[model samples]
Target: MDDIYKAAVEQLTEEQKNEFKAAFDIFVLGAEDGSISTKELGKVMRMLGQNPTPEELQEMIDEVDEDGSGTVDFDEFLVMMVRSMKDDSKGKSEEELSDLFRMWDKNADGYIDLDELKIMLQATGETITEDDIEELMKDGDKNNDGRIDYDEFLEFMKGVE
Candidate 1:
């Protein structure tokens, strides 16, 4: 919400709007007021396959509540999708990440191997144990490739953001 971080947001396509409306209607559970209550968010997220704790539920609202309106209205949901599709303040867009991927790919093998990332992180001054490094690798290395290719790196970076 910092002024410096403000960037142009996007509008949804008609199809996207319809999809959101369908889910919104299911969760509204209110007097057709165009918004879903905060309490139902837990169940809504569960429907989407995430088991959020109460704390995480509130954090979800905090992220999407652009107008500070407590409940998530249709407009707020639209806004959340717009922002959600964008890179955050500290985020690097996919375009920028191309060069970054190579920088971490270390042996120029076109993939980010575990040892490469571990050494890169350590040299950059962030001390991490091998176990923690293993977790990071397992997370980014989708398909059990033992390395993170560009596609997986893109997915991993977006999730990190």
Candidate 2:
């Protein structure tokens, strides 16, 4: 409810503070310097069923991108949500998945290959290995073309489906 979002950080109950802290951490974990981009916020909003329009997304960023970095830091994010926000919607998985696909499609080639995936996995400081890449490719490269396009990437992400 509005109360939760509106409450000041220090004013929040321990439970409320802890819950929102975890929420902010999810996005921060992916950031290079703990900033959350508009796209990221929009994705979360969409998942929450808010499905903000382009203009609304812009408005959202305008509210919290206080330093002109075009994104929000955690404190700003908390303030942004406190001041606004309050969400269900269609699965705009393509848009969301495309964002992720582009992240791993290092060369902007519109397709992700083994090397690109390897770069992303390793770059994340994870223990993903050669065998893991092979298995991952096997599952993602359904037609075995050696690379995966948006559709394959989509399937890879929504694997359970």
Least accurate 10 contiguous residues by lDDT in model 2: 84-93
lDDT of each: 0.57, 0.58
Q: Write the per-residue lDDT of candidate 1 for residues 63-107, one digit (tens) a residue.
A: 666577866665454445445443343233466777776766668
| Residue ranges of candidate 2 with Cα displaced over 4 Å | 1-92, 123-126, 158-161
Write the residue-wise lDDT of candidate 2 on 1-161 in tens digits: 34665766555676885565566566547667656655555544643545533444544633545566666654454455544433212224367767876865778888666676656555554565566764555567668777677887777666411
Model 1: residues with Cα > 4 Å off, grouped in runs = 1-92, 123-127, 158-161
Cα error, candidate 2, residue 27 (Å): 47
**What RMSD does each model have against the real structure?**
15.3, 18.0
Q: Name the TM-score of candidate 1.
A: 0.35
